[PDB]
Amino acid sequence: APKAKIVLVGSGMIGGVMATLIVQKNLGDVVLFDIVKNMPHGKALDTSHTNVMAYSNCKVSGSNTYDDLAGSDVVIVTAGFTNRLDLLPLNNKIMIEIGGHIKKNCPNAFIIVVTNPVDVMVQLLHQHSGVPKNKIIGLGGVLDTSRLKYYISQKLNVCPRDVNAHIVGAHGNKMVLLKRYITVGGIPLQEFINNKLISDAELEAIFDRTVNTALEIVNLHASPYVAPAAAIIEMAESYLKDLKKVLICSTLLEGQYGHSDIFGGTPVVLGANGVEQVIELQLNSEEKAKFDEAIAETKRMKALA
Amino acid sequence: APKAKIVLVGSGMIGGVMATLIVQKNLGDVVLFDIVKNMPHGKALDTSHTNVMAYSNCKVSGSNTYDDLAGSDVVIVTAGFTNRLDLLPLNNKIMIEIGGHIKKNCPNAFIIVVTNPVDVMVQLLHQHSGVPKNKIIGLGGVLDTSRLKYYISQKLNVCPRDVNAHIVGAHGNKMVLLKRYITVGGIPLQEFINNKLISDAELEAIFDRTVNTALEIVNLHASPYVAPAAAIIEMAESYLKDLKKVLICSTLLEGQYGHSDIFGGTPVVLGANGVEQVIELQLNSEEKAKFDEAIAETKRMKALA
Amino acid sequence: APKAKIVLVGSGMIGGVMATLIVQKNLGDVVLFDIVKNMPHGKALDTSHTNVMAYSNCKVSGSNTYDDLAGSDVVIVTAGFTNRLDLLPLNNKIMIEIGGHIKKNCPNAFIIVVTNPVDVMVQLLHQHSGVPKNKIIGLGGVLDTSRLKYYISQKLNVCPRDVNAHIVGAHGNKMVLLKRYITVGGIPLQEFINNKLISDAELEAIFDRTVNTALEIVNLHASPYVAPAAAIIEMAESYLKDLKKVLICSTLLEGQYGHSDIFGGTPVVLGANGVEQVIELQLNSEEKAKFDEAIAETKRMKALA
Amino acid sequence: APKAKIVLVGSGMIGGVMATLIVQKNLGDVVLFDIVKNMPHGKALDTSHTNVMAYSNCKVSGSNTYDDLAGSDVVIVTAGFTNRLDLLPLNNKIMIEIGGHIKKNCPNAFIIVVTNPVDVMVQLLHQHSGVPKNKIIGLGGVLDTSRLKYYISQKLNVCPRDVNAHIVGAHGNKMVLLKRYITVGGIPLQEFINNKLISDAELEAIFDRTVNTALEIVNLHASPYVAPAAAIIEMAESYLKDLKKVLICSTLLEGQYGHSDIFGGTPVVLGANGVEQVIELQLNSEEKAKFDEAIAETKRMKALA
């Protein structure tokens, strides 16, 4: 069947929601892969029954063998151990193992990396898998901006999706939030600030909140996995359905912002041909300085893998 | 049942698509009303069967009696005769007749006016129906900008919805297209122009195309009714589901842009409380001059009704 | 792009709704083809703008040249002149012309025939196009049963889709309604009759209503095209998304019900491989007698083409 | 806002998926309530961001105070300790506490009970909350039959939703699977058995699999919560949107099947008025004997609470 085959390399919390959302949207057949014995089979069985409730027809199966990567159209990697820097070499080993199988079983698959630090892990897998630069991206901006877009929408009382924002450079503490590129209903946010509808102080607090959301969720005795999963599926769906959505993801930089041979967060266009366009925001020197900071941290960690 | 009741006052071409789209989205019960005998019943019967194909449960009935306006949550007016100025007094008579029944049968319904010239006809109905200012709007910007957003998206090869634009003042020849407020993926269009991805000349042609689309469709031996219907439903749905989307519609101006006691196109926020916010774009003197032109034409025609 | 290409051979009323529904569901690129100059271009332009309102990315274009059949994944034929028997030879000529181009431009496309009498016209196109038997079907049962399912659901006050029914043999006056195969929520209808929830007399009236619905809609000064379009799209979507839905359509009979070398309405399974299964209902002699009647009328008209 | 308010009393695994699915479907505002400090707030924050990805506008908040039950339109109870019979009195205490607050804060809310044993726990809450019989149901048949419908659909290679089946009496080991009431595309399953498309032996194995699915998932080192959540949402959605779907749920029996003053699984119709119809299947003596067995076990456990 010409039905897309989506292999989720890692059957943890994010993997579970991704599987659920795929069936809900009837995106394609799903394989929940992991090295943990049977668990992926158990989650796959549970999820497979939702086909009835959702009027879908997507096979959902578990797997403990890399062989099931064969025929994969899309591969989503969430696998990985969770100082923080001590995991770098370890997770690189996981990227190496996965990359070798991708190269052997599905060299033409579209890859989405989630493993943290994503900006580092994505380039590592790109290198070990050998896939073209336009066929591999990392999760970052879609998730990070969903927080900023959401918090602003609540203050302004408008549909969350009506707020657009851009966070670039890298996923994580060094993420670059661009106040200048925020709009509401397509209108520059500054107009709403001029109107006293939202203050600069309110925005600064929202910015800090955005950068520290994962930490905030963790401190509330939970962990972020639902939004990450939803952000990942928006990306995968844009590719599978050739939507050509403009989404901020970690992609290989070839001179943009003055950086090369490194992956960084920036808006790109995802369609049937993968990363069809890499958009370079015309940042000013101040924003560029922050982007530089993001890249520096990515390079720092890359060197330790 | 707490199911919304949507009464379509006018069962023509736009009315038919609206009915179809309502069932597709299971938005609520539909009444296709018109003075033409039986036709609304015939279209209603045809459309009612689609409930099976769409897994919906919306009653779709025809009507030839104004009494069916009772219990209406949303009323959509497309009725109206189609120089052009000679129809003004005639269509005003239709607005008067409809307004009297709305006032009597559903004073708390949310009204959307389509009848042209919409900016004139909407204020007339507002006056004859007596509903609050936040409960009546006219179709305009959503439809007009859908053209501009779509044409630009094709030139740039991105998802149509990713292009945001603003057309204000009035629906029609005097519509004000604001080049300065166009974005792609939330990014100012000017950046794409600086990049040679789209030229100023290309945009000028797209602008003219946008203003003359209805005429273009008519010259191709067709008439626009599908997009208008879809634009209307996006508006009605934002209200019914309390989405709080920022949509450009004709609303009563109370000083915005320097105009009062007149309806004009401008972004507003539609939610459970109707027009929850009227957004005033901070236009420069040049854009304001064009808006003035739009209002002037509306006043001109209003005076002839 | 791996986006499906759907060519609508005939840009009339049914064609328009199909185009609209395809964009709503983001099913694939659409081509509105017809011999009428420009009209398809005009309808295509109007419909194309709805991509913004629906968050879709489907190209919608018009066409006046058969060449655009190239690359077609799905072809839907509604073209055709509308005694009634005098049109048979004329419409056969249309089927011949279309069939020659399908054979030349898209021999592997999946074909859905709507032209009436569908059961006759579908076999004619099958013959002239040369496509495999599993790649061509005619619209019939999905539309006819949607009426029966809907009317029964209203009497019983249950979701329309919860009522399942089977109408076979042929589309049209000789359609075979099988009372014995009607269920509500999967429960045999007879149980509801035993319960006095619906009477046999009520059902008989609903049956007559079902058979005469087109005529009823026509007498109300309208024409059925919305449900037909929706029924057609349910079929096309099952194929495109490999849903494997059980849908009653006109398919080539190879001995089922005692008939061969003729097309007739019967439940089939539509998936990525087209007609993946032809299901033969185990009818009793009485039901079989009626089916025979349906086939006889189809053969009668086939002989006059 | 006239937006429905859904309070999830219990913020565990099933609660999380329910919250996620509600936003995906934009069903209404969600409150994740639990006695565990902050966790519901953490899950609520994570889930709230998905509003952007799903184009929804549903508030998702956590809560540690029963007061938030005020204004609730729908209340879903999953809270509860997890011999097995020793938990009965304990879980009854939870039902009592919740029931008192429902009675005080939202007496007109529609209640769905999940806590096991559901058939027992649902009647207990019905008693402690005092809500009308038509406003409270327990999860059972929708989940159980989704397994049976799914397994059969895979053997027959048809859309999962096209297989309809009925499991009644009680949720759990004593569930009554009715082979006689299974259909495929509305066609009696027996016809497919006569055709050798599926054997009686295959079905017997599927039956055992259906009854032991939770156990099977648990043995694979997982736990069922995704399907349960999806089944619950289908029920809640039928009520909220007045779909009037026929769904098998635990409801108060008033003489049906010969049982009274007890809750049992049976098809019902859920609409704006809650349980609008309780459907009694015309079971034979053999099926009735099994149903009796189910009720007996429910009564046994009820007596120990």
Ligand SMILES: CCN(CC)CCC[C@@H](C)Nc1ccnc2cc(Cl)ccc12
């Ligand atoms: C002792 C166990 N070892 C080595 C035999 C297993 C392999 C270890 C490294 C390479 N890979 C992994 C380690 C841990 N988890 C993983 C999850 C997925 Cl999905 C894929 C690979 C993983």
Ligand SMILES: CCN(CC)CCC[C@@H](C)Nc1ccnc2cc(Cl)ccc12
């Ligand atoms: C001769 C016929 N006349 C007067 C009796 C009918 C009423 C005329 C004016 C007021 N109204 C109308 C005229 C024409 N079309 C309409 C469509 C709708 Cl939906 C509602 C009112 C309409």
Ligand SMILES: CCN(CC)CCC[C@@H](C)Nc1ccnc2cc(Cl)ccc12
């Ligand atoms: C005089 C005009 N003639 C002959 C040149 C045109 C061709 C006539 C027959 C074969 N075909 C047709 C006749 C009428 N309508 C049609 C609509 C479609 Cl979409 C496709 C073919 C059509």
Ligand SMILES: CCN(CC)CCC[C@@H](C)Nc1ccnc2cc(Cl)ccc12
């Ligand atoms: C020692 C802690 N006790 C008593 C103070 C808390 C209350 C205990 C019983 C009645 N209720 C409960 C016990 C355990 N979990 C629950 C989860 C939810 Cl959502 C609601 C009520 C719960």
